[PDB]
C-alpha cells in the first residue's frame, strides 16, 4: 500500500490479522471435553483453561491456528454470518446437524434478522440512556415519596 | 388460447444476469400503504360524519352497511331488532342520506373517495 | 507561471510523467509479451505521433485498461471478503484490562545497504498516530505518560527523539493484543481517525477497517 | 505559496485547534475564494503552453 | 409479546414436518384450465394452504370477519386472512423413504 | 470556402462500409442466381450437406430452393410488429429405390428474414443487427504444453458444430495420449483401422531416436482394425455395448463423415499448406472399401514429432495471430443455424417414414416447417450475435454493423478472456481498430473493423497495400491477409515521395509489425493511408496524433452516442471522411442518375431523369428510432436545377449538405469560472437556447392491448365511468387521443374499460356509494396514461383491430392501439455534452448572455470549459481544434485535417496571423485603437513573458493571438481577465443521456409478489437499490435506526411501512417495525428444505413470528 | 430496494455550503409526499389528507402554497446522498434539501473526492430518514460537514481540489 | 448545519450516547407539542417564513439547542421508565 502511495493506518490491518489467527488447534485435551486437533476460538480455550486451573484440573494445550480471511469468517460462531457469506449448503448442513444457536452477537446476522444493530446507537452501552427535564424530574422525584405513604 | 403454456418466472430478462421475469410482477392482492391509509381515513371521516345524525338512524344505517357484524341486515331484520315496521326503517335511511347530503355539501371532507 | 507547471506543482492537476508525455518524449513502449520494445516513440503528443508509435502505445494502453477493469472487480471481491471477516469487531469496553502490547519500531534496515535507516515519516504516523502508550516513555528530558493518546505533535516528538536515538521502539496498545470479547476496546484501538479524538464506544471498527482497506483496492497497478 | 500539502496541514491544524464548525466555514471560504480567484487568474491551456526544452 | 434474541437451526423430523403440514398435496395439478381456481388436492389448493380472499371461503358461504377460524363444511376452507397462503406449508408423504441430497453430496458427506 | 491539408493522397476510395453484412448475406442467399448455376455454399451448402437422405427403402433428394417475395414491406412489418421475412420453398424430389416410384412434388420450408439495404434485419417489428464474430481459424496448430515446459502439444480442429476438438498430447510417461471429448487413449490405438501397424509406424518415423518407442504398444499392435475399433468404441462411448457395427457407424460419423464433420475450406487449405502435404476432402479420415484410410493424423503427427525434435522449418503457431483467426459473418452464421434446423427436419422426415403407408407418401406429408422455422426464429431473436440495432444516429448503425465481437455462442465469454484475446496483436494493424472498444468489462473483446479492412471468402480480414518496385510506387493495390503481410516488408504512408518515387535514404518500414529504418531498395510495399489503421469513428477525430489513446477511445464511443439536432452542424475542422459516412449510411437521398428536380416540398422530391423516367423520392419525416432519436430528411435543392448523378438531394438527421453533423460548432473559452466548470462540468452561455442549438427531437411510442378476459371482453371507448369532462377533451370519437394534442403525465392517451373482478364493496365503501348514490357500475377504467417524466405532442396514430384485413392478431386479443408521441427537448441543466477528443461533461448551470467572458467586439463565448481536465487526460487535439476553430471563425472557412496527415503548428499559426490581420484591421477600420484594459493584460503578459518586450501593443496582441489566447472581459465586472485566454470554435456534442429521462424519485409504489421489495428501474416506478456496501457504510457510521428503516420500514416491511405512512399522514413519529417479511419467506423456505428454524427468546423459548397464522 | 428514495445525475454546487446539497423540487415533492400531506392538512388548503393527495396526483396544479409548505416540512431535516460504487462510509453523506429549478441534483465540490465523483454524467441517489431517531443519526454523525478527516487515514478527506488549489497557489 | 456540535461532542463520552439523547428528547418534544421544552421564548429556534416567523417544526434542532443549554439531565437507569412516561403524560395533556 505504501509502495502504491496509499496511506492507511495500521489499526485496520491489525484488526483483520487478529481475526485471521483467532483460531486454535487442540493438542492433549487434558481434562476437558475437547478432542485432539479440535479447532476453536482463542478466548474460548483461554477461559476454559482459566476455569480448569481454578477447578484444579489439567488445562488444554493448544497451538495457534491462522487461516485465510475467507475460512476465518467461514468458521465463525454465527451461522447466519457464514451462511450469508458463501458456501451456504455446507454451513447450513453442519449447522443444523449440530443444532447451533446463533446468539446474534455480530451485526450482519442482526442485519438479516432485521433487528437493531448491536453497534452504533444500537450499542447496548448507549441505547438505554434516559433523558429528562427539570420539572418532570421533580414530579417523578415526588413520585417516590408518595409511594411510601400509600 | 387454452393451448398456450405458462411462462417460467425465472425466465431471464435482457442480457443482465441480475434480473428475472417474476420479480417484475407487482402485488395487487396486498393493500398499499396509501390504500390502507385511504380506507382508514374513509372509515374515520364517515364515522364522524355519521355522529351528527340521530342515534337511531345512524344505528340503522350501520346495520344496513355491515359496519357492525359485516353482514347486510335487510329491512325486516332491522324492523325486528328495533321493534318497528320495515317501511319506517326505509324512510329513516333516506332521511339520513339527505342530511349527510347537507353537511357534506358544506365541509367537503367526504366529497372525495369518489374514484 | 506556465499553466501546466503550475497545475503540476500546486497539486492541482497532472503528474511529472503526464507532463513528460505532453512535453518531452512519450518514452519507451511495451509489447504484449511484456518485454519492452527496442525503439522509442520520440515525439510528444503535441508534436504528434506517427502511426506506428500510436499502434505500439495502443498495445500498452489497452493492456493497462483491461488491468484497471479486472482490478475493480477484484477490489469488490477483496472488500466483501474483509467485511465478512471483520464485521463482528466493535468498540465495547472502555478498558479491556490487558497489559499486553506491541512495540512499533521507528527504524527499518535496507539490506545490503547495511546501516539502519529512520523509517519515513508517513509510516511512523501510520503506526503511531492515535495510539495509546502501553507504558511510560523517557526521551529528550521530557516524559510521556502511561495511557496517553498520542497526537500528531506527539508522534513528531517521538520521531525527534528517535533521531535523538533515545527510543528505537514505541510500546503501544493494539487491537492485536486486546483481550476484548468479540471485538476490540477503546484504548487498545485508538483515536477515532475521523474526529481526531479517542474512539467513541459502540463504533464498529471492523466494518470501518474493511472499507478503509477496501477503497484503495482499485488503485494498485504498479 | 499555498499548495495541496500546505492547505492540508492548514485544514488539519485548524481542526485540531479551533473546532469542527470553524473548519467547515474555513473550507467553504477557501472554496469561494479559490474559485473566484481561479476565474480572475484566467489560467488557460494553449498548444504552446507545453513548451519543449531546446535540449531535447 | 417477547423479544427474539436467538435463532437456531436444526434437522426437522418427519413428525415435525407433518406438524407444520396443514395437509398433503396428492394431485399434481396447479389450477383448473378455465376457472383458474386451485385444484382439489393440487399444489395451490385452498383447503390446506388457506383462502385466496380474506375471510372468504372457496364456495362463498361464510363471507365475513364475523366468522373466524371456523372451517367451512363443503370446501374445507378456513375463514381467515388470505395472507396465510404465504406461511402455511403442505407436504407429500413418500412411498419409499428418500435421502436429503445435502447430507449425501456435501463435501465432507455427513451420513457417509 | 473549404480548405484541405496534408500531402497524403489516397489512391483508392474507402470501400463500401455496409458491405460485410450485405455481401456475406448475399453469398448465403443466391436469390438472383439460378438454381442450376448456384455456388453450393451457404444455404445450398446446408441443403447439399443435409441431402440426400436414405433409410421400406425410401430415398429422398433435393433439387432447388426458391426465395419468396415478402408478404409485407419494411414499414408494414415494422408497424405491424411482424418479422420481415419471405417464404422459402424448397423443391425436393422423393424417390423409391426398390419400387422405382418417382413422386417429385414441390414443398415448403419456412420463413426466411431478408436483410435490408442498410444491412440490418427486422424481427417482430424491431430493427436488429447481427454482429460479426471473431474466433480462431480452422486447421491444425501447435503450442507448448501448459503442464510440460519441455515439449509441444498438438491440436486439430474443424468449424464449430462441424465436429469436436482434437488434442495430441504426450503425457509424461514417455507414452502419448489423445484427447477428444474429455478422455484419454494412445494414438496407435487410433491408428487402428487407418491401416497402420508396428512396421508402418516405425518405418520413416524415426529421424528421431527417442520419440518412436513412446508411441508403440504391442498389445494394441497385435489386434487389428475392427477389434481395436470395438476397443476404442468401448473406451470413448461406455454407454452402449461394444458392438462392431455400432463402432463402425459411430466412428464413421465422428471423422470420415463429410456432412457430420466439416473442416473449414480455409482450414483445409491452411492445414494443406502447413504440414507439407495435401488433402482430398475436408474429412480427417476417409471411409474406403469398408476400411478407414488416413488423411490428417499421419502428416500432423509427422509435423508434431518433427517440431518436437527441433528440426528447422517446423515451428509453434501464434494463437492470437490474425492469420490463424477468422471472422464469422452473418451469412455463415445464418447458414450454420439453417443447417442445424435442416438436420432436425431430417430427423423428423426419418421418423415419419417408418409408419403410415410406406408405399404412397408425398414429400408434403413427409416434411414439416417448424424445425427450420424455429431454428431461424431462435437464431434471430435469441442469439447474442443478434442484438438491437443502434439507431441513435446513422454512424451508430454504421459502426454497430462494422463491430466485431469475441462474445456470443461458439465464441468466448467474459470470464475466460484474459490478456490473451483482449490485447492487441502485431497483425491488428490494418484489420482491427487498436483503440475503439467499450470502456467496461468488455475491453478488447468487442472491437471494430478498420476503415480499409475487408473480409474475404475464407473469413480472413485483409488490408490494402501499395506495391513498390525499386523506390517506385505502383498504382496496383493488393489486399493482403495477416500471413501474406508477415512475409513482406512494408513502408509507411507518410514516407516522403518525390513525384511517385522515394526521396530519403532512411525509410520507415516494418518486418512483421517490427519498426525498422531501411533503404528504398528492399521495400516491396507501402501503406495506402494511415486511415486504414483505425475504425470509422476514430477517423473522425482531427489531430488524433495529439490525443491519448484512452480519451480517443472515449471520443469514438461518445461519437456513437450522438443525438441528432435540429440545427446540427458539421465540424469546422474535419478529417474528410464525414461525407462517405453520410453516403454509405443510406440516411440521405441522392440522385440515382442524371436529371432535373421538378419539385421539392417535404414529402416528395420528384426528379425527371435523363433516361426519360419520372421518379419521385418519398422523404421520411420524423420517424421514431430505437432510442427515440428522430430520423428526418431535409431537402436541399431548388426547383428546376439539373442534378448530376450521385449528387445530394435531401440530408439525414446527422447530415449537413452531405457532411456528417453530429453536434454543433460553438465558441469555447478555456478557463475556470466560479467553480461551475469544476470536475469537467460544463458552463454554457444561454444564447444557445435562443438559437435553438442542441435542441433534439425524441419520439417515444406507447402501446395498449384490448383482450378478452374470462370475466369479460376489454373495449376501447371514450366512455369511462368516473371520468370528468375536462380530462376527456382530446379523445374525440373512439377514445383515442387526437393528432397534435399536448399530453401531460397522467393524461389519457387512449381510454379502455375492463370489467372488474366482481366483489362486494366494503361496509364503509358501500356507505360512501350510498351517500353519493352514484351507481357502482360494471366496468372499471384501464386506460393508458403517459408515464411520469414523459410527455409531448401526438403525431402518429395506429389502430389494429381484429376481424380486419392485413392483420393477424394473437389469440384472445381483440385490438391493439399504438400512439406516437414526440417531444421537443432543449439543452437543460444536467444534460451531457462532449467533444471528439474524449472530453466528457455535464451541463452545470447555464449562464445568461448578460454576464459572459466576451470579446472587445462584444461577442460572448458559448461555453467556458475547464482547462484542468486537459493535462490529466492528455488530449491536446481539442486545443488545436480550438485554435483552428478561432482562425476559422474569423476568416470564415472550414478545414479538412486527415488523421496522421494533418495541419501543422506553423500552418495554423499562419492562419491565425491572417485572421488577426482581418480582425484588428477591421477594428481600426471602424475607428478604434487598442483598449486600455488590453494594455493592462498585455503588460502583465509581458512581465511573465508571453510577449516580446519592446514591441507595440498591436504586435503583442498579435503575438498573443496566434498563441490562441486573446483578451477577455468579464461580463459581470467589465474588468479584463488578468491572463490571456484561448478561445475559438470547438465541435461539441449533445449525447444520449439526459436528466429528462434519468431523474426519478418515489415514495410508495408497487411491490413484488414473492418478496415485498419494491420493483427496480425508472420504467417500473421503482425505488433505489440499497446495496450491501451501503449497509457497510451505515454500519461504519453507526446509525442503527437509519439502517433499521432501510432494512425494514422503508423497504419491504408490510405493517411497518403501512403504520409509518399512517403515522406521517397523522403527524406522528413512525413506530418500531417487527418482521422484514422477506425474512419470514427465508424461514419458510428453510423449512421447505426440511430444516427446522426456531426463533428463540432471551431464555431459549419459541417465539412465533407468524401470529396465529401457520401455528395450527 | 427501498421506499422514499430517488436518483439523478449530478451538477456542481459552487454557491452551496458543505452541510447542504441541491435537492431538486419534483424529486423532493415525491420523496416527502406524506410529510407534505400532513403540512397541507395543518396549513388550511384542503380539509384533510385525502384532499391534499388527490390535489397533488391529478393536474400538476402546483402552487406557491404547496411549495412553501414543502419548504416548511423540509426545514432543518437532512437527506442521505449515495454514490456507487460505495467504498468508504463517506460514499454516503448527509446534506439538505434545497429546492432548485432543474432536474439535476447539486453536490458540494469538496465532498466529491469522498464519493469519487466527477460530472461526466455520474449519478447519485437520495434517501430520506423518517424517524426522529434516524434523523438524529443523520444530522449528527452522518452529516457531511461533521465528517472531514478520513476514518481510514486520519488526514482530512473533505479538501480543496483542482481550481481551488489553483487559485490559492495563484 | 448544527452549531455547538463541538460542545455537544464534549458533553458525552461516546457520540452514539449523544445521538440517543437527541433522538429521545426530540421524541418527547414531538409527543407533547413543544410544551415540555426547557427553552425560553427568545431561545426558541424560529423558522423564517413570509407568512411569519414561526416555531421550527423540526424536533431534532429543538433538542440540540435544548441540550446545548444544559438544563437537561441524561444518564442510564436515571429514573424508572414506567413512572417516567406516566408522569410525563401527567404533566402535559
Ligand atoms: Mg464520472
Ligand atoms: Zn483492549
Ligand atoms: Zn365454504
Author numbering:
A (entry chain D): 1356 to 1505
B (entry chain F): 324 to 438
C (entry chain D): 1017 to 1238
D (entry chain D): 905 to 960
E (entry chain D): 2 to 113
F (entry chain C): 2 to 56, 62 to 1118
G (entry chain D): 622 to 791
H (entry chain E): 2 to 94
From the paper:
Transcription initiation is a major control point of gene expression. The initiation process is best understood in the bacterial system where the conserved ∼400 kD catalytic core of the RNA polymerase (RNAP or E, subunit composition α2ββ′ω) combines with the promoter-specificity factor σA to form the holoenzyme (EσA), which locates promoter DNA and unwinds 12–14 base pairs (bps) of the DNA duplex to yield the transcription-competent open promoter complex (RPo). Here, we determine crystal structures of Taq EσA bound to an us-fork promoter fragment, as well as a complete RPo, refined using diffraction data extending to 4.00 and 4.14 Å-resolution, respectively, allowing visualization of key features that stabilize the upstream edge of the transcription bubble. The results also reveal functionally relevant holoenzyme interactions with duplex DNA just upstream of the −10 element and potential protein/DNA interactions that direct the DNA template strand (t-strand) into the RNAP active site.
The resulting complex (423 kD) was crystallized and diffraction data were collected and analyzed. The structure was determined by molecular replacement, which identified two complexes per asymmetric unit, and refined using data extending to 4 Å-resolution. The solvent content of the crystals was 82% and examination of the crystal packing revealed space for the expected position of additional promoter DNA. The protein/DNA contacts seen in the us-fork complex are essentially identical to the relevant subset of contacts in RPo. Strand opening propagates downstream to +1, but in the upstream direction, the base-paired T−12(nt) interacts with an invariant W-dyad of σ2A (W256/W257, σ70 W433/W434) to maintain the ds/ss (−12/−11) junction at the upstream edge of the transcription bubble. The stabilization of the upstream ds/ss junction involves a previously unseen rearrangement of the W256 side chain. In the presence of the upstream ds/ss junction, the W256 side chain rotates away from W257, filling the space vacated by the flipped-out A−11(nt) and forming a π-stack with the face of T−12(t) otherwise exposed by the absence of A−11(nt). In the us-fork, the −11(t) nucleotide is absent, whereas in RPo, the −11(t) nucleotide is an (atypical) A, being part of the engineered non-complementary transcription bubble.
